[PDB]
Design a protein around this ligand. Structure first.
Ligand SMILES: CCCCCCCCCCCCCC(=O)O
Length: 211
């Protein structure tokens, strides 16, 4: 793999953002995190066993997911989030995938704290046939309230190193499956640090492997 995806399903763009109330007047959004793969060296690898404890146990945990396979569909994304941006704006998440196959997708996003699942969001999205390939658009999903509240608290911490200590215990697991066949298509584990404002958001993608 040279990016986040397989031959069956590719991530095109992913982002989490806030538009301030003013946006109606002069548009603007702040990206907390953001992946853009609008384009065509193999990724680095990380053994999945090192991150087992950072995600839930039993059904829906990394070990049982990896065991069910397929192994090539598992990725780890490290985000340096930009928490420099404010009261009543719109907080949103947007995702877009592509495949050659027409499918109906189920996307499950699990927020975990100290490796225990804290909240879950499950969504389905049917293929739209555009330009020989199929596109899946989950755009402008309102950010769930736990996460907006978490962000507002985090941003007020007096020191970056304490934000990093707190974020050390906060992870997100995304499982995309073929809603009709139950086949897993993509599983992405996210881990987080804060960036330094002068540096906006950045990320690094790894393949999750298993010796
Ligand atoms: C430290 C800020 C965390 C970054 C904001 C979340 C970005 C990762 C994906 C969030 C998707 C979760 C879907 C949801 O639960 O609303």
């Amino acid at each position: 793999a040279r990016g986040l995806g397989t031959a069956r399903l590719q991530l095109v763009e992913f982002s989490a953002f806030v538009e301030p109330p003013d946006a109606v007047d002069s548009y603007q959004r702040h990206l907390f995190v953001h992946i853009s793969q609008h384009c065509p060296p193999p990724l680095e690898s990380v053994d999945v066993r090192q991150i087992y404890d950072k995600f839930p146990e039993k059904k829906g945990g990394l070990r049982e997911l990896y065991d069910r396979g397929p192994p090539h569909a598992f990725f780890l994304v490290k985000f340096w989030a930009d928490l420099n941006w404010s009261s009543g704006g719109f907080y949103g998440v947007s995702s877009q995938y592509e495949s050659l196959e027409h499918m109906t997708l189920t996307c499950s996003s699990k927020v975990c704290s100290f490796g225990k699942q804290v909240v879950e969001k499950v969504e389905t999205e049917r293929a739209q046939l555009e330009d020989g390939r199929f596109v899946y658009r989950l755009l402008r999903s309102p950010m769930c309230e736990y996460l907006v509240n978490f962000l507002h608290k985090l941003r007020q911490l007096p020191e970056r190193y304490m934000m990093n200590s707190v974020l050390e215990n906060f992870t997100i697991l995304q499982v995309v499956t073929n809603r009709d066949t139950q086949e897993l298509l993509l599983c992405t584990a996210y881990v987080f640090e804060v960036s330094t404002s002068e540096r906006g958001a950045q990320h690094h993608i790894y393949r999750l492997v298993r010796d």
